[model samples]
Target chain A: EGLNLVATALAVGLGAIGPGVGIGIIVSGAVQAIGRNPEIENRVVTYMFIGIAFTEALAIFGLVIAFLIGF
Target chain B: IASRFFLYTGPPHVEVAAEVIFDGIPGFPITNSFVVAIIIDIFVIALAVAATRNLQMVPRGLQNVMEFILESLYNLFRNINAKYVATAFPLVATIFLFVLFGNWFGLLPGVGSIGVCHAAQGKKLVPLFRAPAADLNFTFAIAVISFVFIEYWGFRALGPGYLKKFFNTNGIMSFVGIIEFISELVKPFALAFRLFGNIFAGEVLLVVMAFLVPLLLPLPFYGFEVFVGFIQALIFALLTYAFLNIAVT
Candidate 1:
């Protein structure tokens, strides 16, 4: 029973790590682009958010998995 | 040690679940989130009344603030695509402002804490208010609105040719089109779930924090929550705009 809890926790934790890294990479590139040209900030910000949302999709699935497993 | 960390005696009240505030018609139930929705209706009308009172040619006070917000959003929509921005602005602005207000209202103290007690269910407490976005139905309903509007725009702009986006017959390109269609189908779920998860988690965090410490610690979380609310609202509006942009062109 305890092992199931740990497994479920691990599912979300590991699921989050990939997105965390993915969004960081995205932000890094977005920042570099913004540094190069400040005028394009609006479009860059929009793109970055769209990118982040897609990346975070996997983590939301992971969280849902944890709920199913734990419950 | 773990038991010592928790102060609230009962189970966590902050949950993905919402409570029925009252019985509506027959077996029907009216949830707390729906109550918050009605509040938003009145709030919007009240603002319009206030903003219209003593309207100035130069625009001062409340009207100035109101005009500024509308102007910025109008400009943003125009930037996305000048052709359809006027048609798109009303829906975009409504979703953004409504969700933004709902999220902030959730952050107000005692949103989940203060409520009328129902004696029928063993004196159970139901929160008087809740953020609509925290509820899956609310988010999903808005997501459907976005989805249908995007598809509608696609059909309106490109007619039956928009069907080719999903049913292409260029051999290998047909396979890719199927994948694209699947992705399009998934968009509404993704948007709904994303907003629902974040706001629900925010509710949980605020409840847990307020329960454990009951002091200055949750202030930072409040600021964090305000930032999250603003970002989420902007994302929803922007995503709606981008989807419409893709649909049209």
Candidate 2:
């Protein structure tokens, strides 16, 4: 059980952290782009949301694996 | 009783059922992956069709939700290609919905449990449910469909110029053009395999976790699966859009 816990933690931790950083970078770029072109903010925002959802899903999967280990 | 309930006795992995043959010709080969995919498709289509059949100007309940989704998808595809969207929307949307449901369905209790089936060698074999995307054949077939459609749309949009896109216009970039051409041919393999590998790995992780502890732990993974399902569907659709855009031009 201890080994399982540690392994699960590693999987979840790496999974979540990698995607979290990716999302951060993506959002930062998106914000900069939107600021530069406020007129196209709507289209930019739409694309940003789609990117966020995709990245967030990866983090969610890690979180799930972590919880599964805990139980 | 233990044997009956504990269907999976070994490690979880994808399995392909052998094809049945009559004389020398081969017949249909069924696998758990295909079975699960077909079942999910049937269920979603049934639900959507039933809800939308008696459509009213003022939508209510399930019909409203279904209409909303369809409208959103229509708008999304329209931004890419109006004509191609009109024809390809049904196939693409069906693939997304079916794959999404099939992936998430594995999270349900008693899913993956096997029922007794007669084997080719005259022995009892247990068949279990697996995500369709986990199967290489299904994913490869989907890749082929996407590739074919991309070319079809390209031909429809740009007649002879479509073929010309592959051949060289200038001698300077001819080598680079050859590389680009090869990459295009390889795109479907990469697309299909990436999806198949990620989902298959996730599914294996979930099963291992469940075997270790069968309780609240898997909840988080279930949540993860939900998100993965949605993201994968989006990626599939977005890639389709990108490929179609490239092909048409």
Candidate 3:
């Protein structure tokens, strides 16, 4: 039980770190581009959100795994 | 596992499945989440009636708020693809409003707290309401609905040629098409769980945080949850709009 609890905690935490960095990089690049050319802000925002969506999938998967393992 | 609502002597309970409030009707039981969904629908209808009962040249307070929501969403859809805005705006906006309001409504006081405590069933305490998105069934239904609408638009736009995307005759493209078909099938599951996991996890976090520290500490988390709810709704609606635009184009 103790080992299972540790594994569950580690699974979610470790799984989240990669997506945290990935979305950070995506938003960083997107914001810089939008700042440079405000005229294309809407297009930038659209693509930025789509990018985050793909990246966010990993975190959700990890969370689901944690739930599966924990419960 | 059940206990008194007023007592503070046991661990917090978090159930994945919504509790059944009434089940007199065979094969169609009303769960707590479904009850909230019905209320959300009625609330939305009431708002619509209140806003549009008397249309004026200039809008009033409620009308102004409604117009703002509609116009902002209109511009959002229009910006995606002006051609399909008329066709796709209603589905996208409806989803956005339903999810947005449902998430917000769950945060209200006495929502998850106040409920019936039946002594006959071993003191089983059941709430009258739950966050709709927290339930997998609700999210999955919406995802399936969105998927059906997207495919409908794709078929409407491309006629018989839409099948080629999933079943190509070309040598290497056949493999790609098979993969594309598989991914297409997976889309609804991904969409459903993305919303469900986010909302359910947020609720769990709130419960745990409240249990750990029941004071000013949870205030920031509540504010953050409000933002998270809005973002989840926006993502769900935006993804639908983007998928619809992709399908038609």
Candidate 4:
């Protein structure tokens, strides 16, 4: 019973840890790169979205896994 | 259950079913998402009417804003490839505006938070007006729209050899082509799920936050949802353009 709660929390929590790191590091790089040279902001903005989407997909998958554990 | 939830709430009671808001024509069913979609349709039409009513020469007021959005969207896609912008703009722009607005619409007071009770599955809270993007059906419909044009533009631009991206070259190396084709098959699913998951999760987070502390907590999160909405819309349009770029060449 305790493990059931433990497992579900971890399903989303453990699953989210890496992608949170993944999105943060890349987005931080994006923010930093734009700081150095703002001219490429437009280009950076487009790719930033795609990168975020890809990273977020794994997070959503984790959410799905968590949902599976819920029911 | 509602009393139990109302009394003790640490986590929220977010019911995630796409409940039938109204009866469908006999066999089929009409969901709240469908109603929200039609609301967006009329909402957009009304905006168009308002914008084009006076028909300003210098473009002041609402006309100015609408034209700016349209032109900016055209320029953004044009940056991808000047060749495909004209055809791609209509589809991509319509999608972005509708989705962005739909998301923001759900964030409005009482849109999804206030509703009649005891009709659906899962959690006790039943919201009448959910964001259309929160529903996979709506997202998948838009994906199919984008999917059709992505290939339409692909085949129109590439001719009979559009199929060449599949595989089997006379030479030894064909791995790149096979990978490219496989990637194409997953594009629609990726597009749909990305938008769907992002918006739905945002809604869940907002409602949960509101339930946790109904006072002032969910405010900043609404702003966060707006940012998410904007980025998701932008990503949807850009990915559609990007996928078409892959499809043609």
True contacts kept of 4: 0.36
Q: 3 or 4: which has the higher TM-score?
A: 3
What is the DockQ (computed on Cα atoms) for candidate 3? 0.50
Residue B78 lDDT in model 1? 76
Evaluated at residue A51, the lDDT of candidate 2 is: 72
Worst 10 residues of 3 chain B by lDDT: B1-10
TM-scores across all candidates? 0.89, 0.71, 0.89, 0.87
Q: How does the DockQ of candidate 2 come out?
A: 0.10
How much is A33 displaced in model 4, in angstroms?
3.5
Candidate 2 lDDT by residue in tens digits, B115-174: 345534554444456677766777788888888888787788787777665677678566
The candidates, ranked best first by TM-score, are: 3, 1, 4, 2
Fnat for candidate 3 (0 to 1): 0.36
Q: Write the per-residue lDDT of candidate 3 for residues B106-206, one digit (tens) a residue.
A: 88876666555652356655766688888888999999999998898898879887888878888899879999878877899899888887777777677
Q: List each candidate's DockQ score.
A: 0.50, 0.10, 0.50, 0.56
Off by over 4 Å in 1: A64-71, B1-27, B119-121
**Least lDDT summed over 10 consecutive residues: which range in candidate 1 chain B?**
B1-10
Candidate 3: clashing pairs of residues: none
TM-score for chain A in each prediction: 0.89, 0.79, 0.90, 0.82
User: Between prediction 1 and prediction 4, which has the larger TM-score?
Assistant: 1
Model 4, span B76-191: residue lDDT tens: 77778887777777788888889988887788878776554642454444456888998888889898888888888888968778887566675544667777777787779888
